[model samples]
Target: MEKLVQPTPLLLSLLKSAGAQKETFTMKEVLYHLGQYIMAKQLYDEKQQHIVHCSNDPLGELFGVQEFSVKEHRRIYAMISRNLVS
Candidate 1:
């Protein structure tokens, strides 16, 4: 890992949100937290059964995630993502 010159926003955010006081944060835990944040903000359309970051991806945006393959892949975006399948 590179020596971070500045406080990386994602990492800082994830670190704070990573775990409880005594909970040891692991690789899996860190990743799980980060993914949760990204997913919460991005919107989706249920009828289409896919994510909609604006189908058009029009106008100026910091990151260009257009021409993305597959409308969306819905799975595991939260701490408790899946239902308790009976």
Candidate 2:
């Protein structure tokens, strides 16, 4: 069975900033919410479709990188997941 994951305080704060109000979520749900927020904010890099330009302070705080690529999302997802509790 797949397990639901709970967010840490830091992750929860970041998720809230991304417009997702939830205590727990599947990994996909979190990513989807984050994507929606990014689109709404026009946070993608102008010259690089695959890159996300983190102009938002909260997002940059979680990502620890102002410029992150789409692939990096999965990488960071795993990193965050490892820190979560089911």
Candidate 3:
């Protein structure tokens, strides 16, 4: 038989603070959702800055193998990078 792990007080408190009503998620599910949320936030912030910077200089871009315009490359790169993380 498998053992069930109970939620810690801190975890319950955090869920209450976040206004989460359902209290049935396993630890793995919680961690998975939390990780996804964090990565999404990071990607959002990065893309926001990328867009702002690209607007200032359409010619300025992310450099790797070769120089390229971020305005022309951000969408594909962002999607690929974010997808890889998930």
Candidate 4:
């Protein structure tokens, strides 16, 4: 995971709103939750049927996510898997 410089106030506010009272999470934790929310939003918009069909490549081919490194991809996949099955 890439290192986070620091949490801005906006990030802290968002965390607080989401019931994260730790004052901060590691960058990896933040990214994991963010990916979960993004996936949820996509599912909400496209419907569960579409999400199920596109599960292997949820972000889409033309979305420029190919720039993400292997570790980043794994992180995103972990988040998606957790959200999908949990």
Candidate 5:
């Protein structure tokens, strides 16, 4: 297994918001936190079942989308990876 590292500060806050206190976490862990946040917030738009509403949260500003569909949602991990840095 690879070493764990911190996610972007924004992601850190997202994880923090999701009740995580750990300083070091893998990308998978971060996504898990995000899933918790999403489920807790019920961010999924009703109009498009798979389209998540991005307003009123870190994801809105971080992903630069007011709303995003399933395809864009899949790419969010890629976006998160960019902020992981070296």
Candidate 6:
């Protein structure tokens, strides 16, 4: 069976506060749509920064992000890195 990463309440809160649509987004899409907050804060924030640029961060934890790859039309990795934990 396949699973998705579980996010922290803090991460979930930030995401909800971002005003995003309920949809499945590739890593980059999530990055773009949430960039206004995710990116800058990613560099430096009490919690957000760890969720972004840090290795094994939380936002990436939501998707279990690990690597990037090339596909027929795009260059993003498959959704294979689900965190699978709370």
Model number with the top lDDT? 5
Question: In order, how many clashes per candidate?
Answer: 0, 0, 0, 0, 0, 2
Give a tens-digit lDDT track for model 5, residues 1-86.
97687677887777888999987887778778877887788998776777778888768887777877656656886667765646
List TM-score per model, in order: 0.30, 0.74, 0.28, 0.35, 0.77, 0.32
Best of the candidates, TM-score: 5
55-86, model 3: which lDDT tens digit per residue?
22211222122222325555434422332212
Per-residue lDDT of candidate 4, residues 1-86 (tens digit): 55443345554444445456654456566655545544554433343332222233434331224333334566555533433312
lDDT of each: 0.35, 0.74, 0.37, 0.43, 0.77, 0.42
What ranges in model 6 sit over 4 Å off? 1-14, 21-31, 44-52, 66-77, 80-86
In terms of lDDT, model 4 sits at 0.43
For model 6, residues 17-64, the per-residue Cα lDDT tens digits are 676554343445444544555454543345433333424455455444
Model 4 residue-pair collision total: 0
Q: RMSD to the native, candidate 4? A: 10.3
Order the candidates by TM-score, highest first — what do you get? 5, 2, 4, 6, 1, 3
Candidate no. 6 TM-score: 0.32
Residue 73, model 5: Cα distance from true site in angstroms? 6.0
Query: Which tens-of-lDDT digit does each residue in 1-86 have in candidate 1?
Result: 53212223434434455342223344455445434544554534455434444344330121234322232333222211221111
Candidate 6 backbone clash number: 2
Q: On a 0 to 100 scale, what is the lDDT of residue 6 in model 3?
A: 38
